[PDB]
């Protein structure tokens, strides 16, 4: 046969098109799954991952840290208007809270 080329390479992605296709085909979603659905879904998932990781890395650099910890992920998500809307009913373990003291409580 011709040398195997992964579908992620064809699409230009780093998320697995084949694994996502298998998860869609074995997830009880529809009788059939189209050929462009896994590509679209992998692209969207990779975009969201890149956004969160960029913001979390910025937070890690701000705290003079080389590694991302759950605190940096929480800081990234809660300081973004849209990531906070997406992860609104979501709890991040060991993330803590945003520093926020009400104005009437100050001296």
């Amino acid at each position: 046969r011709a040398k195997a080329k992964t579908r992620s390479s064809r699409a230009g992605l780093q998320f697995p098109v084949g694994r996502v296709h298998r998860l869609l085909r074995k997830g009880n979603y529809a009788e059939r799954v189209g050929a462009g659905a896994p590509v679209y879904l992998a692209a969207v998932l990779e975009y969201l991952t890149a956004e969160i990781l960029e913001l979390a890395g910025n937070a890690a650099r701000d705290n003079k840290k080389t590694r991302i910890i759950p605190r940096h992920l929480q800081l990234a998500v809660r300081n973004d208007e849209e990531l906070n809307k997406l992860l609104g009913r979501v709890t991040i373990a060991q993330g803590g809270v945003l520093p926020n003291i009400q104005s009437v409580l100050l001296p």
Partner: peptide, 12 residues
């Protein structure tokens, strides 16, 4: 159980 309650938890 938490996801049923609408309280999704990440990290476990």
């Amino acid at each position: 159980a938490l996801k049923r309650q609408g309280r999704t938890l990440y990290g476990f």
